[PDB]
Amino acid sequence: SQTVASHVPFADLCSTLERIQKSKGRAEKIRHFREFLDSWRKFHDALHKNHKDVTDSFYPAMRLILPQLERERMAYGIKETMLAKLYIELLNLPRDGKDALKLLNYRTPDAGDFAMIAYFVLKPRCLQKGSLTIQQVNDLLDSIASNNSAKRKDLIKKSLLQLITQSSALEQKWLIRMIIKDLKLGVSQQTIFSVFHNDAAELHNVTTDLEKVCRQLHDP
Template sequence: MSSASRDSPLFSDFCRLLESISARKGTDLKKQRLEKYVQEWRARYGDFFDAMRLLLPHLDKERTTYGMKEQVLAKTYVDVLGLGKDSEDANYLIHWRMPGKNKQYQKIVGDFASVAYEVIASRSTVIRGTMTVHDVNQQLDTLSITSGRQQQRDIIRHFFVNYTADEQKWIIRVILKELKVGMSENSVLNVFHSDAFNLFNVCSSLHKVCVDLKDPFIRLSTNDIAIFYPIKPQLAHKELPQDVPKAMGGTDKFYIQQKLDGERLQLHVKDGVFRYWSRPAGRARS
């Protein structure tokens, strides 16, 4: 769940960070901007988890799905905004991949969040963002555990009534689990801590990464696999049999798992408790 602390920065400031990172050319400049934000957050708010799960929504295993892809979001916004089903803006939302006659939309066709922003901006009455990063995470936590159409509509309406059009654009990107700012998960995690990427690979938990590596000057003392923290599986790699020892780093002792069709699972067992994960290491099943 989100941090228990209510002391949280404005979400509008977080959105400005994303805009700034997206506009910068080159990974080094993007990392420099993010590093400054992380330092300021640590100094004032401490736990970075609330921000990390918004920076890397596709890795947030506590919110594996929102049950809303582009088509559902489009229909929900048509409803929330009170658009006529056959209106031009409703058509742009529903058919966001197709170029229309409006030149403004032709430039952003194929990017649902940007199309939605253009439709929302002319109707939004929120001029200045007043909601915090913590507020956003609370709403997203609720959205992730609801499947009811009316509940989804109520949350999207809450976003429309309380957030600027620009903020809603980034919220939509989080819901779709793709920020499109030009930074890989490796880069983001390494800005947070030099051991963050390695730790995430053996625990698949952004929350654990933020807790265990809260101090950027303390290196990780151990990187062992732990029960009930699924490791990030290594992708299969094709090699000829005679080349396998070299591919394994020249060692004479290694393990190979034969690749078979079907489900590949991780099973963790302790004290009579069984939990298993599919290969993407999503939400645990007991």
């Protein structure tokens, strides 16, 4: 296609995020993040060797890794009780049942947020793994934000059901955390920006062109 995100599955991103969250100590989290960056550039190179000159922008992934910096999309207009009802009819669970109740009676506490509970409910029964790329997830989230800007809760529910019915339980966990806009990764935004930049700079391999260096040192 046109971009790397159109070929990277959303399951790769969700897997990376799950490893980061489950990792203790910054070294392992950072190492998984660098694993994901290296996989990204790897996809870029494979696509170029298959004669597909694609952008190498990481923004389609970074906007999901840092949802609270999301400014291209507007507010999703989704709160956790909507997700409770949604998940409470899609599932065919008994209203005020054992599992079903937990979603309604939820209180924001470490890592005991709504997404964790929804994942605990979805792991027993759910769909055929995942099938959407990062670009398709970004398109569906774009549709949710747009429909919210047009004041159409019905269409919000529509597009989000499109998201859910094509995603595995894990993918739904991290999707929920991306709509609520806090991932609880155990590592800071400052650190993510730092590892991103330091990765680029470490791999830049600046080449000393002595003539260009002379022209640089001779003129401010």
